[PDB]
Amino acid sequence: LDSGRFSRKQLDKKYKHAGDFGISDTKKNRETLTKFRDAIEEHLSDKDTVEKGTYRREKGSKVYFNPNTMNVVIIKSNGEFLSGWKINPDADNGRIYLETGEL
Amino acid sequence: KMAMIDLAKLFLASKITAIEFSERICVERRRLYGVKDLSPNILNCGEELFMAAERFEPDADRANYEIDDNGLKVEVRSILEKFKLH
Protein backbone atom coordinates (compact mmCIF):
# COMPACT_ATOMS: atom_id res chain seq x y z
CA LEU A 1 0.00 0.00 0.00
CA ASP A 2 2.57 2.54 1.22
CA SER A 3 4.13 3.23 -2.18
CA GLY A 4 4.08 6.53 -4.03
CA ARG A 5 1.84 9.35 -2.83
CA PHE A 6 0.30 6.74 -0.54
CA SER A 7 1.15 5.14 2.80
CA ARG A 8 -0.60 2.27 4.58
CA LYS A 9 -1.04 4.40 7.68
CA GLN A 10 -2.80 7.34 6.02
CA LEU A 11 -4.96 5.00 3.94
CA ASP A 12 -5.97 3.19 7.11
CA LYS A 13 -7.03 6.30 8.98
CA LYS A 14 -8.99 7.51 5.97
CA TYR A 15 -10.65 4.26 4.94
CA LYS A 16 -13.75 5.74 6.58
CA HIS A 17 -14.06 7.63 3.29
CA ALA A 18 -13.67 4.64 0.94
CA GLY A 19 -17.44 4.25 0.75
CA ASP A 20 -17.52 7.54 -1.17
CA PHE A 21 -15.29 5.94 -3.79
CA GLY A 22 -17.49 2.98 -4.64
CA ILE A 23 -15.98 0.66 -2.04
CA SER A 24 -18.67 -0.53 0.37
CA ASP A 25 -16.59 -3.29 1.92
CA THR A 26 -17.25 -2.73 5.63
CA LYS A 27 -14.07 -4.59 6.54
CA LYS A 28 -10.75 -2.79 6.91
CA ASN A 29 -7.82 -4.99 5.93
CA ARG A 30 -4.84 -4.95 3.58
CA GLU A 31 -7.07 -5.99 0.68
CA THR A 32 -9.66 -3.27 1.25
CA LEU A 33 -7.12 -0.50 1.82
CA THR A 34 -5.80 -1.64 -1.54
CA LYS A 35 -9.14 -1.12 -3.27
CA PHE A 36 -9.17 2.27 -1.57
CA ARG A 37 -5.67 3.08 -2.78
CA ASP A 38 -6.74 2.01 -6.27
CA ALA A 39 -10.03 3.91 -6.31
CA ILE A 40 -8.01 7.01 -5.39
CA GLU A 41 -5.47 6.64 -8.18
CA GLU A 42 -8.26 5.88 -10.66
CA HIS A 43 -9.88 9.10 -9.43
CA LEU A 44 -6.76 11.18 -9.92
CA SER A 45 -6.24 9.52 -13.31
CA ASP A 46 -9.75 10.13 -14.62
CA LYS A 47 -9.70 12.59 -17.50
CA ASP A 48 -12.73 14.32 -15.99
CA THR A 49 -10.87 14.87 -12.73
CA VAL A 50 -9.19 18.27 -12.57
CA GLU A 51 -7.49 20.39 -9.93
CA LYS A 52 -9.88 22.66 -8.11
CA GLY A 53 -9.17 24.64 -4.99
CA THR A 54 -7.47 23.61 -1.81
CA TYR A 55 -7.95 22.49 1.79
CA ARG A 56 -6.92 25.80 3.37
CA ARG A 57 -5.99 24.01 6.61
CA GLU A 58 -3.23 22.08 4.83
CA LYS A 59 -0.88 24.88 3.68
CA GLY A 60 -0.40 24.37 -0.05
CA SER A 61 -2.61 21.34 -0.58
CA LYS A 62 -4.26 20.92 -3.96
CA VAL A 63 -7.60 19.20 -4.39
CA TYR A 64 -8.70 17.22 -7.41
CA PHE A 65 -12.39 17.27 -8.19
CA ASN A 66 -14.41 14.99 -10.43
CA PRO A 67 -17.77 16.57 -11.51
CA ASN A 68 -19.25 13.16 -12.20
CA THR A 69 -18.69 11.46 -8.84
CA MET A 70 -18.50 14.84 -7.05
CA ASN A 71 -15.52 13.43 -5.19
CA VAL A 72 -12.43 15.32 -4.07
CA VAL A 73 -9.01 14.01 -3.15
CA ILE A 74 -6.61 16.20 -1.22
CA ILE A 75 -2.91 16.02 -1.96
CA LYS A 76 -0.39 17.74 0.31
CA SER A 77 2.19 20.22 -0.95
CA ASN A 78 4.61 17.28 -1.13
CA GLY A 79 2.34 15.10 -3.25
CA GLU A 80 1.32 12.93 -0.29
CA PHE A 81 -2.29 11.76 -0.26
CA LEU A 82 -4.04 13.53 2.62
CA SER A 83 -7.71 12.66 2.35
CA GLY A 84 -10.77 12.68 0.12
CA TRP A 85 -14.56 12.43 0.06
CA LYS A 86 -17.73 13.28 -1.89
CA ILE A 87 -18.89 16.88 -2.20
CA ASN A 88 -22.53 17.57 -1.38
CA PRO A 89 -23.79 20.39 -3.66
CA ASP A 90 -26.95 20.79 -1.59
CA ALA A 91 -24.94 21.62 1.52
CA ASP A 92 -23.47 25.10 2.05
CA ASN A 93 -19.97 23.61 2.43
CA GLY A 94 -20.30 21.85 -0.90
CA ARG A 95 -21.61 24.84 -2.83
CA ILE A 96 -19.02 27.10 -1.22
CA TYR A 97 -16.27 24.79 -2.41
CA LEU A 98 -17.84 24.78 -5.88
CA GLU A 99 -18.10 28.57 -6.03
CA THR A 100 -14.76 29.34 -4.41
CA GLY A 101 -12.63 26.20 -4.41
CA GLU A 102 -12.19 26.50 -0.64
CA LEU A 103 -12.61 23.05 0.87
CA LYS B 1 -33.43 11.48 9.97
CA MET B 2 -31.04 12.81 12.58
CA ALA B 3 -28.61 9.91 12.76
CA MET B 4 -25.72 12.39 12.60
CA ILE B 5 -27.11 14.76 15.20
CA ASP B 6 -27.78 11.68 17.37
CA LEU B 7 -24.22 10.41 16.91
CA ALA B 8 -22.96 13.84 17.96
CA LYS B 9 -25.04 13.79 21.14
CA LEU B 10 -23.89 10.23 21.80
CA PHE B 11 -20.32 11.49 21.39
CA LEU B 12 -20.85 14.55 23.60
CA ALA B 13 -22.36 12.23 26.19
CA SER B 14 -19.09 10.27 25.98
CA LYS B 15 -21.13 7.13 25.28
CA ILE B 16 -18.87 6.66 22.24
CA THR B 17 -15.24 7.71 21.68
CA ALA B 18 -13.91 10.34 19.28
CA ILE B 19 -12.54 7.57 17.07
CA GLU B 20 -15.93 5.85 17.07
CA PHE B 21 -17.72 9.09 16.39
CA SER B 22 -15.34 10.03 13.57
CA GLU B 23 -15.96 6.75 11.75
CA ARG B 24 -19.69 6.30 12.25
CA ILE B 25 -20.25 9.90 11.20
CA CYS B 26 -18.93 8.94 7.75
CA VAL B 27 -21.27 5.98 7.55
CA GLU B 28 -24.20 8.19 8.52
CA ARG B 29 -23.29 10.98 6.10
CA ARG B 30 -23.03 8.48 3.25
CA ARG B 31 -26.41 7.02 4.20
CA LEU B 32 -28.20 10.38 4.36
CA TYR B 33 -26.37 11.69 1.26
CA GLY B 34 -28.74 12.63 -1.54
CA VAL B 35 -31.78 11.67 0.52
CA LYS B 36 -34.53 14.17 -0.20
CA ASP B 37 -36.95 15.75 2.29
CA LEU B 38 -33.97 16.80 4.43
CA SER B 39 -33.94 19.91 6.60
CA PRO B 40 -31.32 22.50 5.50
CA ASN B 41 -30.34 23.25 9.08
CA ILE B 42 -29.99 19.56 9.86
CA LEU B 43 -28.18 18.90 6.59
CA ASN B 44 -25.61 21.64 7.12
CA CYS B 45 -25.19 20.80 10.77
CA GLY B 46 -24.31 17.27 9.70
CA GLU B 47 -21.83 18.67 7.17
CA GLU B 48 -19.94 20.71 9.78
CA LEU B 49 -19.82 17.73 12.14
CA PHE B 50 -18.29 15.73 9.27
CA MET B 51 -15.63 18.39 8.64
CA ALA B 52 -14.90 18.69 12.36
CA ALA B 53 -14.36 14.93 12.56
CA GLU B 54 -11.98 15.23 9.57
CA ARG B 55 -9.77 17.40 11.78
CA PHE B 56 -9.62 14.83 14.57
CA GLU B 57 -6.37 12.92 14.96
CA PRO B 58 -5.64 10.83 18.08
CA ASP B 59 -1.83 10.82 17.58
CA ALA B 60 0.16 13.31 19.65
CA ASP B 61 2.11 14.38 16.56
CA ARG B 62 -1.04 15.62 14.79
CA ALA B 63 -0.85 18.77 12.64
CA ASN B 64 -1.47 22.18 14.17
CA TYR B 65 -4.91 22.51 12.58
CA GLU B 66 -5.86 19.00 13.70
CA ILE B 67 -7.55 18.40 17.06
CA ASP B 68 -7.68 15.72 19.78
CA ASP B 69 -10.60 14.08 21.67
CA ASN B 70 -11.25 17.25 23.65
CA GLY B 71 -11.30 19.87 20.97
CA LEU B 72 -13.43 17.61 18.84
CA LYS B 73 -15.88 17.60 21.75
CA VAL B 74 -15.70 21.38 22.03
CA GLU B 75 -15.99 21.76 18.25
CA VAL B 76 -18.95 19.36 18.07
CA ARG B 77 -20.86 20.97 20.92
CA SER B 78 -20.24 24.34 19.33
CA ILE B 79 -21.59 23.03 16.00
CA LEU B 80 -24.80 21.65 17.54
CA GLU B 81 -25.38 24.93 19.35
CA LYS B 82 -24.67 26.95 16.22
CA PHE B 83 -27.56 25.13 14.56
CA LYS B 84 -29.60 25.03 17.78
CA LEU B 85 -29.73 21.25 18.09
CA HIS B 86 -28.22 20.80 21.55
Curated annotation (Swiss-Prot), chain A:
Tell me where the transmembrane regions lie. none
Similarity annotation: Belongs to the cloacin colicin family.
- Any additional notes? This colicin requires TonB for its uptake.
Q: State the protein's purpose.
A: Colicins are polypeptide toxins produced by and active against E.coli and closely related bacteria.
Q: Name the chain's protein.
A: Colicin-D
Instruction: Supply the source organism for this entry.
Output: Escherichia coli
What is the name of the gene encoding this protein? cda
Coverage of the whole protein, first to last residue? 595 to 697 of 697
UniProtKB/Swiss-Prot annotation, chain B:
Q: What is an example of a Pfam family matching this protein? A: Colicin_immun
Gene3D superfamilies found in the cross-reference section:
Colicin D
Gene Ontology terms for molecular function: toxic substance binding
User: Would the keyword Secreted be found if you checked this record's keyword annotation?
Assistant: no
What UniProt keywords are attached to this protein's entry? Bacteriocin immunity, Plasmid
* BP-aspect Gene Ontology terms: bacteriocin immunity
User: Per its UniProt entry, which superkingdom is the organism in?
Assistant: Bacteria
Q: What does this protein do?
A: This protein is able to protect a cell, which harbors the plasmid ColD-CA23 encoding colicin D, against colicin D.
Spell out the protein name for this chain.
Colicin-D immunity protein
Give the taxonomic lineage as stored in the record: Bacteria, Pseudomonadati, Pseudomonadota, Gammaproteobacteria, Enterobacterales
